[PDB]
Amino acid sequence: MRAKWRKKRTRRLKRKRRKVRARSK
Amino acid sequence: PKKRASNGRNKKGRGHVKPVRCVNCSRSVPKDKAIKRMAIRNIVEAAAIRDLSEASVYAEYALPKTYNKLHYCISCAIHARIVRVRSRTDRRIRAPPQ
């Protein structure tokens, strides 16, 4: 996997995580 | 490692050189990493000149040349044999062959 793609994936994951956190709040 | 001390570009003292598009495939390439071949072709092909002359009103006529500078992205150049792969020892020669 390209590093850039990995980074992108991570970012995507983090968005979801953020959303989850917001929901929890 | 560095394949080229020039980085294959020719800028150094600059910072950003504006890109020119490729004449073959439009691959946007910096104006220095550009491979510039200036083609002075005659407007009429070498074999078809005589006929033209025969046709022409006013004998002893100029017959002009067409002028254009061509910009090849390096890959394209490589493909089209404008440039060739050279040995490590003779990559260094900056002087044109002719």
Binding site: - | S26, R27, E45, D51, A55, V57, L63, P64, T66, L70
Partner: protein, 127 residues
């Protein structure tokens, strides 16, 4: 002694034009394109087609009375190509060898003083 017209060859990398007009360039005397003569679609540009077109044009010219032409050679120009198509030279040759008279030949390709953006994107036509 002579009757003059404007030959107006426009040869793109696909499909080629011949277009005889008067000296004013407003009124027309036969167009005839490479796609008219050969119906094989890829052969719109090929020299043979161009030659055929030129021949056709010549006949028309003869019929009208235009003994002589000035040729304006043209590529697609602007953002596109700039290099003349394969069926311009052929067309010219055909014109020459029809008994028709020649003189004053120029490139009229629409060269920009730097233009709008070219088609293809950053990485261009990746084949």
């Amino acid at each position: 002694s002579q009757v003059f017209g404007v030959a107006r060859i426009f040869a793109s990398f696909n499909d080629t034009f011949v277009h005889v007009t008067d000296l004013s360039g407003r009124e027309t005397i036969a167009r005839v394109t490479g796609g008219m003569k050969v119906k094989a679609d890829r052969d719109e540009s090929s020299p043979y087609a161009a030659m055929l077109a030129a021949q056709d044009v010549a006949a028309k010219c003869k019929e009208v009375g235009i003994t002589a032409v000035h040729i304006k050679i043209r590529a697609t120009g602007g953002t596109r190509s700039k290099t003349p198509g394969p069926g311009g030279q052929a067309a010219l040759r055909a014109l020459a060898r029809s008994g028709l008279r020649i003189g004053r030949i120029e490139d009229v390709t629409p060269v920009p003083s730097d233009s709008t953006r070219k088609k293809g994107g950053r990485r261009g036509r990746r084949l």
